[PDB]
């Protein structure tokens, strides 16, 4: 348990709320335009608060353009978005230069337990009567209840959005509303001369007034620095975290289970909730480890220069904990002793550490408020292990704050947290909540308990804490329900009793009906279900009716363009890490495969293979596991293969079976040694022995072995040998074609596969798949419309047949067998030659570009200029590159690729290693495959009735300036926006299309 988790290098920072505001706005804009969010919904408000909390000038210029260019005519939903959007701009402008705010705006829910007819227990959170707002919640809390004695939302949220900046002043505070002889449900306590902590009217008033203002105006945490532990997904810790970030806090959050899953949860919260000035650092951390605690606090306080944060905490919230269930005093062992360390001794060591760091720097006037989770229930349930001992021993910190030398560095605010409902039914004891509330006790949603604890961080109860320790009772009257163990136990009895009797009556009525109606009215009762099969579509573009097409473009355009000289993309395809353009789009856009996605990927990777024949005796027609030949239905494919598909697709560890046995953990190099002492003779043919002689001369002795005809080869003293050795290489990951991919499955033959470099197989499959996206199933159909001299290939590679180069520069050297024509296969122009030689048979142009990482755009550019010169009517266009051992190594010596070992230090996984535009980007991720487009004259596309996926308006290439760095990118493509502005008073009539059409 006590093992170290914490590394500084694993820490992820989230600080870019300036970007997530724009994405939050544009998300809500299209949500409302597609009718997903309505006016009535409470989401448009909770979202609005978050957009206002990130208000800056950039974000108003953004909202203005997006709301002042909606056509309110095109539908009701466009009027809705423009009404709401104008409101949201008015608010955002007021709140500009105002500190952002925690404001819970959730519908307050109470518990409901249902038992139906058949004895099923259902739990549902159920809108309360007379508590529809957060304001109303603080009134309910102040009035206590009978047991605490001592002698425009959801109709028109466009209107409620308007009333978010408008700060609400109240003539009378709710403190006066607190009836005498009644203890409120939320209240602070005061220590009496006897030593006990009693309800204090006065302190409690102050707290509840700050809590009333928070409900109306909201609370800021601008300039608050917070450490929080035990704040994982679906905890009070995590609803506190949302509120801190909501009010612009800077927060360190610690996880015990660091992973992509968790680091994505937290990215998702910052991007929804982090207001302007907020940051979130997520670090892995074991609160059970003394060494992790020392290390964490030293990372928070160290200078950015020494690799730290340079912060100084204003609050510690140490809510980390492990559960111990049915551990009675007989059974206290290792888990409980470890739990006690997490929940008590290492809490003391963490406040000890923040005292030593604050004192080191002589910080005497910026104390950190520690918020300790206390219990009111010390020992009163049992089976809790050492939980009660843990909780009760923190009450020593309310005394030691007076008695030691750390009160200027630290303040204690103990929160006695009460009954907080979890998710549903199983979570907490949700089924008996309703029953406990009937006693006059109040239970809380997690979002209400979050509210109560963010109360303790308001400026008023920060002010008390700094005078004297604050003990907050957020337990809603459970003090006063007597014998709570045996009460709670009676309530669970009564629900179970009722459920069991009801379920026993339900079983017998089924048996004593099954017997009267056999299997006649209990067997013909049951319907027939349709499991969907995969109907994979080509995704040709939807053609609208002509009357709808003439709206989009201006009327002057008819007869104005020369369609012989408009280039149009007519089909496209690819082979890469996610299979085809179809499957890459599903992964790119939705992050998950459809039924059609899964079947295409399973067919590609070779998991499934269609069968139409005899299959273990009977005749069969369908899919079949390619390994076992067992029948498979499309419905079973996700469950059988989706997991296998995702392990062996995409960016992942290099798979040596794919790269000719390349194992980056083990690279064969060779060292040149001189032989000190002569070797043992080995046999060799006459011709091989003469080859050793020709090389070594005096340093080798070759002799006929007179019986056989073979030769002895003594390598003598002073002879050179090469001895192998093995580097461990640090680039372990790559974007590899999905394991299984085989040119055979597409229909390419073994004769072609043996002859040709593997990059050429990616290309052939891309050119076919591209012609099918263009509805050209037989390429020769082109030659009904166009001369054999009018089809071009303007595709290319950065490096070309890079397995063929290994053949002629390494495999020959090692006298391995290599095809005589290996050199032809290495040329960057051979891929195109094979495409002509096997599919097209054109005599049209062939302009193969090399443009390193820009060959594909250069290819388009050449392809267009070849068409607009009237050399070609159609052109294949695109790019291809393979991944091999030699280029991987060389891109590593150039420090261009990400070092995979560094990435593992940072706790990154292969998926999250290509991260463009990101703070922490540290080089690229090598991948392999091909992309092809087919481009034509628009004229010829309309005549052929081929699909038209887009118009290639422009395609350019630029170099940069004088340099001495070949991999350095430049600004030279700026020249596509070159225009003169000396004389920009009056509009050029050459831009007006009406004018241009008049002249025609």
């Amino acid at each position: 348990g006590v093992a170290t988790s914490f590394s500084r290098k694993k820490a992820r920072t989230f600080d870019s709320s300036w970007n997530w505001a724009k994405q939050s706005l544009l998300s809500l804009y299209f949500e409302i335009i597609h009718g997903v969010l309505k006016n009535v919904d409470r989401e448009v408000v909770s979202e609005a608060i978050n957009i206002m909390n990130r208000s800056n000038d950039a974000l108003i210029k953004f909202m203005e353009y997006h709301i002042s260019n909606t056509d309110e005519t095109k539908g009701e939903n466009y009027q809705l978005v423009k009404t709401l959007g104008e409101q949201l701009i008015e608010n955002c402008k007021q709140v500009l230069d105002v500190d952002p705010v925690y404001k819970d705006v959730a519908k307050p829910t109470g518990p409901k337990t249902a038992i139906d007819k058949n004895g099923n227990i259902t739990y549902s959170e159920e809108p309360r009567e007379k508590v529809r707002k957060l304001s109303q919640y603080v009134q309910e809390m102040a009035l206590g209840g009978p047991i605490t004695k001592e002698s425009a939302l959801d109709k028109d949220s466009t209107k409620e959005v308007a009333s978010l900046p408008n700060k609400s002043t109240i003539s009378k505070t709710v403190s006066s509303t607190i009836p005498r002889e009644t203890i409120p449900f939320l209240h602070l306590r005061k220590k009496t001369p006897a030593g006990d902590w009693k309800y204090d009217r006065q302190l409690s008033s102050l707290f509840l007034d700050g809590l009333e203002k928070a409900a109306f105006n909201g609370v800021t945490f601008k300039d608050k620095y917070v450490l929080i532990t035990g704040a994982g997904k679906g905890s009070i810790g995590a609803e506190v975290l949302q509120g801190l970030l909501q009010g612009g806090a800077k927060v360190v959050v610690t996880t015990s289970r660091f992973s992509k899953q968790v680091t994505d949860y937290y990215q998702s919260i910052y991007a929804k909730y982090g207001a302007k000035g907020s940051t979130l650092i997520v670090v892995p951390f074991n609160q059970g480890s003394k060494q992790d605690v020392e290390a964490l606090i030293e990372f928070i306080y160290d200078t950015e220069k020494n690799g730290g944060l340079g912060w100084d905490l204003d609050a510690i919230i140490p809510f980390a904990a492990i559960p111990e269930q049915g551990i009675e005093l007989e059974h206290i062992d290792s888990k409980s002793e470890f739990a006690h360390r997490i929940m008590l001794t290492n809490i003391l060591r963490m406040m000890g550490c923040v005292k030593k760091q604050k004192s080191a720097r002589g910080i005497e006037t910026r104390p950190a408020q520690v918020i300790l989770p206390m219990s009111p229930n010390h020992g009163t349930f049992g089976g809790d292990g050492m939980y009660s001992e843990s909780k009760l021993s923190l009450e020593t910190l309310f005394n030691r704050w007076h008695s030691e030398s750390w009160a200027n560095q630290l303040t204690v605010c103990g929160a006695i947290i009460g009954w907080t409902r979890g998710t549903g039914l199983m979570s907490a004891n949700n089924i008996i909540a309703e029953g406990i509330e009937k006693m006059g006790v109040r239970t809380f949603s997690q979002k209400e308990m979050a509210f109560n604890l963010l109360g303790l961080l308001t400026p008023e109860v920060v002010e008390l804490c700094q005078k004297s320790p604050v003990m907050a009772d957020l337990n809603g009257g459970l003090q006063f329900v007597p014998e709570l163990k045996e009460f709670t136990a009676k309530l669970r009895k009564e629900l179970v009793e009722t459920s069991e009797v009801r379920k026993a009556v339900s079983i017998e009525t089924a048996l004593e009906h099954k017997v009267v109606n056999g299997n006649s009215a209990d067997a013909a009762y049951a319907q027939v279900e349709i499991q969907p099969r995969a109907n994979i579509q080509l995704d040709f573009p939807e053609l609208k009716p002509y009357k709808q097409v003439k709206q989009i473009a201006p009327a002057e355009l008819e007869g104005l363009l020369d369609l012989e000289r408009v280039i149009v993309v007519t089909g496209f395809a690819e082979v890469g890490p996610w299979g085809s353009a179809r499957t890459r789009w599903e992964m790119e856009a939705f992050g998950e495969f459809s039924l059609e996605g899964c079947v295409e990927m399973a067919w590609i990777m070779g998991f499934i293979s269609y069968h139409n024949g005899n299959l273990k005796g009977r005749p069969y027609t369908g899919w079949v596991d390619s390994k076992t030949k067992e029948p498979v239905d499309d419905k079973d494919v996700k469950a059988k293969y989706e997991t296998s598909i995702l392990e062996h697709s995409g960016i992942r560890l290099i798979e040596p079976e794919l790269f000719n046995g390349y194992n980056p953990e083990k690279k064969e190099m060779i060292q040149e040694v001189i032989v000190e002492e002569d070797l043992e003779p080995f046999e060799a043919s006459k011709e091989t022995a003469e080859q050793f002689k020709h090389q070594h001369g005096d340093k080798v002795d070759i002799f006929e072995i007179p019986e056989t005809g073979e030769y002895s080869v003594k390598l003598l003293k002073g002879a050179t040998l090469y001895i192998p050795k093995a580097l461990r290489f640090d680039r372990l990951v790559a974007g590899q074609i999905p394991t299984g991919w085989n040119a055979k499955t597409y229909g390419i033959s073994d004769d072609i596969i043996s002859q040709v470099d593997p990059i050429t197989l990616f290309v052939l499959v891309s050119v076919v798949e591209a012609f099918i996206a263009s509805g050209i199933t037989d390429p020769y159909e082109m030659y009904k419309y166009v001369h054999v001299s009018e089809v071009g290939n303007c595709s290319g590679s950065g490096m070309g047949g890079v397995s063929a180069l290994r053949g002629m520069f390494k495999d020959r050297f090692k006298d391995e067998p290599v095809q005589n024509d290996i050199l032809q296969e290495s040329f960057i122009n051979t891929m195109s030659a094979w495409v002509n030689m096997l599919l097209i048979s054109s005599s049209g142009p062939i302009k193969t570009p090399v443009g390193a990482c820009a060959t594909s755009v250069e290819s388009v550019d050449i392809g267009v200029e070849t068409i607009l010169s009237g050399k070609a009517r159609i052109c294949i266009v695109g790019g291809y590159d393979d991944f091999q051992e030699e280029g991987s190594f060389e891109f590593g010596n150039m420090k261009a690729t990400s070092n995979t070992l560094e990435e593992f230090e940072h706790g990154r996984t292969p998926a999250e290693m290509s991260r463009p535009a990101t703070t922490t980007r540290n080089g690229f991720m090598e991948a392999q495959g091909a992309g092809i487009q087919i481009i034509m004259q628009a004229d010829l596309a309309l005549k052929m009735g081929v699909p038209i996926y887009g118009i290639v308006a422009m395609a350019a290439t630029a170099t940069d300036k004088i340099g001495r760095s070949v991999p350095a990118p430049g600004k030279g493509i700026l020249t596509t926006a070159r225009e003169h502005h000396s004389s920009v008073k009056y509009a050029s009539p050459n831009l007006n299309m009406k004018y241009r059409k008049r002249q025609l």
Partner: peptide
Amino acid sequence: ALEQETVYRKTGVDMDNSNVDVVTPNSIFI
């Protein structure tokens, strides 16, 4: 057909309070 019939007869710790929320009195087992 006899060959086909032959072959047919052969076959037929978590310290983050994500699971239990131990900060809360009732999550343990109240």
